[PDB]
Amino acid sequence: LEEISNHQGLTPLKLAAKEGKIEIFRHILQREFSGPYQPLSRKFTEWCYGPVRVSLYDLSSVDSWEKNSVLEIIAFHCKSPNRHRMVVLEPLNKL
Amino acid sequence: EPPPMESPFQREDRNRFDRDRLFSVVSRGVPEELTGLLEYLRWNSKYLTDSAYTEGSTGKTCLMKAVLNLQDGVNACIMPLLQIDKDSGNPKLLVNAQCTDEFYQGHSALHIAIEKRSLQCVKLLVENGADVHLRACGRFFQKHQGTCFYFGELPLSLAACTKQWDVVTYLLENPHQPASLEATDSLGNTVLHALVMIADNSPENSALVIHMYDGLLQMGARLCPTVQLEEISNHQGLTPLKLAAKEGKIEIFRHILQREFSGPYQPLSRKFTEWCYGPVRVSLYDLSSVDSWEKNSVLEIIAFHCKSPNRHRMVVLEPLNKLLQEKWDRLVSRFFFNFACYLVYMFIFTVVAYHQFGESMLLLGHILILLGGIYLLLGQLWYFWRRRLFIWISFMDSYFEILFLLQALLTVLSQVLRFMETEWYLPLLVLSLVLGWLNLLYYTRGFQHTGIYIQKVILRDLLRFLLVYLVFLFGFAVALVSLSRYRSILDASLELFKFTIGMGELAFLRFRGVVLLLLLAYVLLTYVLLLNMLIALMSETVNHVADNSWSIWKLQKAISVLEMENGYWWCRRKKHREGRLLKVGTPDERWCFRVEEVNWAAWEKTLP
Amino acid sequence: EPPPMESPFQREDRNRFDRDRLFSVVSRGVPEELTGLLEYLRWNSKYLTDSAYTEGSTGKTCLMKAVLNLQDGVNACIMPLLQIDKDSGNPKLLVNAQCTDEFYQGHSALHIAIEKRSLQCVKLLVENGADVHLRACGRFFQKHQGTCFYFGELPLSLAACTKQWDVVTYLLENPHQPASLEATDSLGNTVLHALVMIADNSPENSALVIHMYDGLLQMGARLCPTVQLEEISNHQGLTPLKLAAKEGKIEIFRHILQREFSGPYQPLSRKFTEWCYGPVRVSLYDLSSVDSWEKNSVLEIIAFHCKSPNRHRMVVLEPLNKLLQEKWDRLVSRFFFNFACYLVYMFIFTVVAYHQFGESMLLLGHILILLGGIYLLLGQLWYFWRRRLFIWISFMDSYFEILFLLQALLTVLSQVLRFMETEWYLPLLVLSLVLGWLNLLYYTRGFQHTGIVMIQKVILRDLLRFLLVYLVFLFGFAVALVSLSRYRSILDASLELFKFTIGMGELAFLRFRGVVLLLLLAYVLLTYVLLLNMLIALMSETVNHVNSWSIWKLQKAISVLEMENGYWWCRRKKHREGRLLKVGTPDERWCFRVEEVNWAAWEKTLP
Ligand SMILES: CCCCCCCCCC(=O)OC[C@H](COP(=O)([O-])OCCN)OC(=O)CCCCCCCCC
Numbered sequence A: 001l002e003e004i005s006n007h008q009g010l011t012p013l014k015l016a017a018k019e020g021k022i023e024i025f026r027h028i029l030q031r032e033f034s035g036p037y038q039p040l041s042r043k044f045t046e047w048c049y050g051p052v053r054v055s056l057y058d059l060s061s062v063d064s065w066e067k068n069s070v071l072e073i074i075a076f077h078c079k080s081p082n083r084h085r086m087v088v089l090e091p092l093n094k095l
Numbered sequence B: 001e002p003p004p005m006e007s008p009f010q011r012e013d014r015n016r017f018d019r020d021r022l023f024s025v026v027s028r029g030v031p032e033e034l035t036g037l038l039e040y041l042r043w044n045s046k047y048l049t050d051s052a053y054t055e056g057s058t059g060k061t062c063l064m065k066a067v068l069n070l071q072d073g074v075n076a077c078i079m080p081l082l083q084i085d086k087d088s089g090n091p092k093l094l095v096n097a098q099c100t101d102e103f104y105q106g107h108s109a110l111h112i113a114i115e116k117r118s119l120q121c122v123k124l125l126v127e128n129g130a131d132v133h134l135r136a137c138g139r140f141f142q143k144h145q146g147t148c149f150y151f152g153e154l155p156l157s158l159a160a161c162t163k164q165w166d167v168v169t170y171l172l173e174n175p176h177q178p179a180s181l182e183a184t185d186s187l188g189n190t191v192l193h194a195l196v197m198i199a200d201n202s203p204e205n206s207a208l209v210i211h212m213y214d215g216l217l218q219m220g221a222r223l224c225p226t227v228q229l230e231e232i233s234n235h236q237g238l239t240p241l242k243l244a245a246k247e248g249k250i251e252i253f254r255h256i257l258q259r260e261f262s263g264p265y266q267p268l269s270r271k272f273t274e275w276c277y278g279p280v281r282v283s284l285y286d287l288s289s290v291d292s293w294e295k296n297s298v299l300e301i302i303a304f305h306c307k308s309p310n311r312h313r314m315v316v317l318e319p320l321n322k323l324l325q326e327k328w329d330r331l332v333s334r335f336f337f338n339f340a341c342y343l344v345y346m347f348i349f350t351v352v353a354y355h356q357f358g359e360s361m362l363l364l365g366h367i368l369i370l371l372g373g374i375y376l377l378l379g380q381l382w383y384f385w386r387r388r389l390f391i392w393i394s395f396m397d398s399y400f401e402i403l404f405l406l407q408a409l410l411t412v413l414s415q416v417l418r419f420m421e422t423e424w425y426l427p428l429l430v431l432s433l434v435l436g437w438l439n440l441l442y443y444t445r446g447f448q449h450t451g452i453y454i455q456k457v458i459l460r461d462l463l464r465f466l467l468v469y470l471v472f473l474f475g476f477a478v479a480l481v482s483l484s485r486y487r488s489i490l491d492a493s494l495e496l497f498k499f500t501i502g503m504g505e506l507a508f509l510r511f512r513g514v515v516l517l518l519l520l521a522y523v524l525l526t527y528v529l530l531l532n533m534l535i536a537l538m539s540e541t542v543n544h545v546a547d548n549s550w551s552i553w554k555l556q557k558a559i560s561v562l563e564m565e566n567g568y569w570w571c572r573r574k575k576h577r578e579g580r581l582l583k584v585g586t587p588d589e590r591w592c593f594r595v596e597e598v599n600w601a602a603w604e605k606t607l608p
Numbered sequence C: 001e002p003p004p005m006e007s008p009f010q011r012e013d014r015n016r017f018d019r020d021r022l023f024s025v026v027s028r029g030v031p032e033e034l035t036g037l038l039e040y041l042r043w044n045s046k047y048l049t050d051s052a053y054t055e056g057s058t059g060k061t062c063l064m065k066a067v068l069n070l071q072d073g074v075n076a077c078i079m080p081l082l083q084i085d086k087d088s089g090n091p092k093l094l095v096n097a098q099c100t101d102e103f104y105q106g107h108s109a110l111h112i113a114i115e116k117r118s119l120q121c122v123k124l125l126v127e128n129g130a131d132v133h134l135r136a137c138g139r140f141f142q143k144h145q146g147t148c149f150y151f152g153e154l155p156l157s158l159a160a161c162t163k164q165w166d167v168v169t170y171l172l173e174n175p176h177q178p179a180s181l182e183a184t185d186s187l188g189n190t191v192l193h194a195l196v197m198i199a200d201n202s203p204e205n206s207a208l209v210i211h212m213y214d215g216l217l218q219m220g221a222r223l224c225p226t227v228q229l230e231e232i233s234n235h236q237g238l239t240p241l242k243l244a245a246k247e248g249k250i251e252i253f254r255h256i257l258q259r260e261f262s263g264p265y266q267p268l269s270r271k272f273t274e275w276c277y278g279p280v281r282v283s284l285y286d287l288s289s290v291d292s293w294e295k296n297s298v299l300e301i302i303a304f305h306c307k308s309p310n311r312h313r314m315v316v317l318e319p320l321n322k323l324l325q326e327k328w329d330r331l332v333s334r335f336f337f338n339f340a341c342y343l344v345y346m347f348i349f350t351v352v353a354y355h356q357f358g359e360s361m362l363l364l365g366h367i368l369i370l371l372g373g374i375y376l377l378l379g380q381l382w383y384f385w386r387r388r389l390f391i392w393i394s395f396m397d398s399y400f401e402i403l404f405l406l407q408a409l410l411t412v413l414s415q416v417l418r419f420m421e422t423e424w425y426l427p428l429l430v431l432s433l434v435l436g437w438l439n440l441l442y443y444t445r446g447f448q449h450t451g452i453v454m455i456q457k458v459i460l461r462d463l464l465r466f467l468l469v470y471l472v473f474l475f476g477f478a479v480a481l482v483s484l485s486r487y488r489s490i491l492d493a494s495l496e497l498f499k500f501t502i503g504m505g506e507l508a509f510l511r512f513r514g515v516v517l518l519l520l521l522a523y524v525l526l527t528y529v530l531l532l533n534m535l536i537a538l539m540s541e542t543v544n545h546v547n548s549w550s551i552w553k554l555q556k557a558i559s560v561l562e563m564e565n566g567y568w569w570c571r572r573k574k575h576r577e578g579r580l581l582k583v584g585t586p587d588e589r590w591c592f593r594v595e596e597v598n599w600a601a602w603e604k605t606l607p
């Protein structure tokens, strides 16, 4: 259901990026589930050693390699005053 | 890029019972599939620690993976795997295997067992011969700006930093191989040093560090009463108190300074209450390595070696505040005698510069000026030779030394040029005169009323806004000069700058309109930049910062005292030790310092 | 310098039973080890209070060492020690022995027992003849900066300041030696004065002080009912209310002013409620020692003798606010008559200074100017003679009294110089004129719109510091610029630089032109930095979200309390405020009626 695009060509993650809906955008980016619902997640924990936590983030529709990605939408297609708050979210910050 | 320690998705790097089958089995936890591994190892003449049975880059063994994949705090393959390893006749047991990658160098299965908070795994590994003094020397375990976790390097320090009292108790009290609280990592840091280094001035971390520090001190007193753990020095030459002083860990430094215990642990105390009467409390403070009589004292470390912004908050703690106040009260006359000498020298400077039998007096003034410049140049050069680090690590509280050195250099050069009869001697002399008159404001710190009375920002805003303003200035200067060809780049820059500071006025010829447009644009842009100046400086004020000017003045007085205490460069001054030798328990004689505290608010909180 | 009162680690200085054995025995608390002391004293003909058995520097005896080492509030050697002292036939009892060192002078074992909160030890000492009126008058027990603890100087005062009701009750009601409430320390301060002094405006401390003040008033109503404790004056002539007014202890001052008791304790009240009607409450306030009719009243002490910053908040408390409002309403016409007289005098001054029967009128104007200067000089000098200390203790709200004197002195000097035909009388005359026109602003406090500061406080504080810094800069750059031109003299160069700094004139600029320009640029940048620093430092106080009405009310109070005395050439008779009403038993007081309306407080009492 995440991959369905509306008439503007935007998936729900991309739509949340464009509209400036930061909270749901962060939740979708950092979605984590355990047990039977793990495949629906976008973030996977690899290992933890004390304070250090290392996790894998899915880069589908987020990496700028794809045309009309989340990064491009935030940089040039979003107009909300919350854009600078979205670039500091994982995995956007380290990417 | 270093490989992940234990990734469920990424297979181990390379860079029947193969390595991949064994890793799959030990990750699942069922020991039944391990049957037949020993026979294959014996037939192929291989040990579990060989290169093919470990991750290629790090050297992580199957035992570490088994510990990394603990489930419900236990992994059923640990004991069978160790049994197979010991039955294989391995000359170096699998328990003591360590990683080889530069990132994870020194990492062992015991470290993973302690980190995973599984006491059963630690007990099982120790019972089988794990070395409890292995050091994790990899870059992941050193302290640096990045992805790292510094806990010392020893398993005992790891247990202490992770708030695992049971693990510490077992490691120090196990009969198989008892851990030693005296053990040190690669940097010489013991467990107390490691606790100090992980300390953050947040209340929660400070409470955790204080609790574990006190617990380890008491347990060391119980287990090793013949040694003092707080006297161990690392490779930097610092005890845990001095290490906390240097690194800026204020909330544990204060606790160590004012530590007090009653009962069997009284010898571990540093504050001893003598008597109380209403709101008045009098206590004896241990001056061990605190008084400036000893080399690398806590006072000197705070004043000259610490670079933390908490420097001035540390010199206002007891007994440091009272000790420095007494030192200042003892050396207050020496400070003002120096002020009087400098004032007389500056008066002679002013007379000689103003007057550029009378000729003999002028020559006497010139030679006195040369001698004064020589004396200050030698005095400042010795100061830099002693404190090369202090000037660099903190410029806001040491720029007056640089100004004194520059004034001495300019005075000496001016006298040398005057002897050489070079025409440029007078500008150097007048610059020296004005700089020396400005240097007279150093001595305002002696008395409080003007001593307490932007400087932080000027090193934080000017270095950016001058760049922007100079870009504006050069652009408009070249634009005006090229259109007028105002006759040179420096001329236009000087005129525009003088108008900007309001000193001069602009003069307007073909293309008068374009010149007027350029001048209007420059004026408006500079006004916006000045507004940005004023706004940036203002926001720091409405921030509601605390009144730390008093503490900054106290720290300035502390630096002045600690430099005056050494005497002049031509006459070493004998050090006077603070406090008196007193017996405080058991032959336990310490140099205690008596501090008297009056606190109505605290006392009233004890009344019914 | 003084030795510690008690030190577990440091032994007493020295400036069978020797001193050390006895002190160790009484410190450990075992009484059986004291056997043989009495026999030794009898054999050596010694006494237990001799210098051989006390600390050399202070005089701390063995008993005081025993009390300083209480365990769970009891020490087993105190009673046997007192018994040994009595059996030894000592002409001066070991109890009531006191220190002699200047720091702990007068300190006794009863003070230690009370401070240690051991009621049992107090009972034991008092039973054995402890004097409950001993005064601990050493430097440690006096009010000053540094390590000290002021609690009065009496055991009753020490028990009161330490919040010990049981010990206070025992001391007041013991039969062996009853303590006296009206007893005074070396400064004449009773227990109430001591409670006032130890009070600070924090809420918990104020609550403690108020609680024990009311309790001691009730105890002084029970015992010695014929003695009015609040009317006792110390060596400075201050009652507890007046002492609270002087010290600036606003909380206890307000509590005493508005004290109201119900039931049997009605005569102790100072505020009496008359009638209520909804949000309207009308109460009588006792003006004893409050009305400015008497000499050294509470109003005068607050206006002219208090120096605490809490001064302006005290004059808005009832009944002070309404009393001062009534006085100001009565004397508002006299104030503006003075304003009109000064305005006419300044108009004549302006006309005469401007125009230097025309000639005869100008001479008459000069004579009038001289007469006005003589009058104002006499008035200001009398004011200083009366209130010398008020000028020093609060300059921020009394500098007009200096400016008026300076204007009168300058006017007199100008006139006498004109008489001596000196040509230096015009500058003095014009300075007198401008200073009088400046002093005309004093009367703006007569009406609220202009009467109702923050920058005035900071400038009067930071003026000297900023002047020091800026004058160092100015002198340095002036001498640097003068020396390089050899800008005629140091004064001329300083004047040029200052006039440019305040924007009055340009800067003058001959080889070494670059160096002169560099010096001028450095001066300009440094002065801009200094002025920005001053602006921000002044700014940091304004943005604190910080009371102008209280300051204006205090100004009006000062003006009223000065106007009541009348002119120097005409003393004015004062009128008592309120009326002499009876409030109980013939307990007649000069009560004052204040009506107060408070909807917010009344609406809370509704269900
Ligand atoms: C030519 C003098 C030969 C040596 C005679 C001894 C004179 C005492 C010198 C002295 O006390 O130093 C004064 C001052 C040092 O300032 P500082 O180190 O405190 O400041 C450190 C700042 N970071 O240094 C000066 O003022 C330098 C000039 C000293 C001579 C002045 C003439 C009057 C002598 C009585």
Ligand SMILES: CCCCCCCCCC(=O)OC[C@H](COP(=O)([O-])OCCN)OC(=O)CCCCCCCCC
Binding pocket: C337, C338, C339, C341, C342, C343, C344, C345, C368, C371, C372, C375, C376, C379, C400, C401, C404, C442
């Ligand atoms: C020739 C007249 C000689 C004086 C006779 C007495 C006339 C009445 C005096 C009078 O009202 O004085 C008012 C004023 C008092 O000073 P202040 O309390 O305002 O000041 C203290 C503030 N801190 O004092 C003044 O303003 C002084 C002016 C004196 C000349 C008046 C000319 C007009 C008279 C009708």
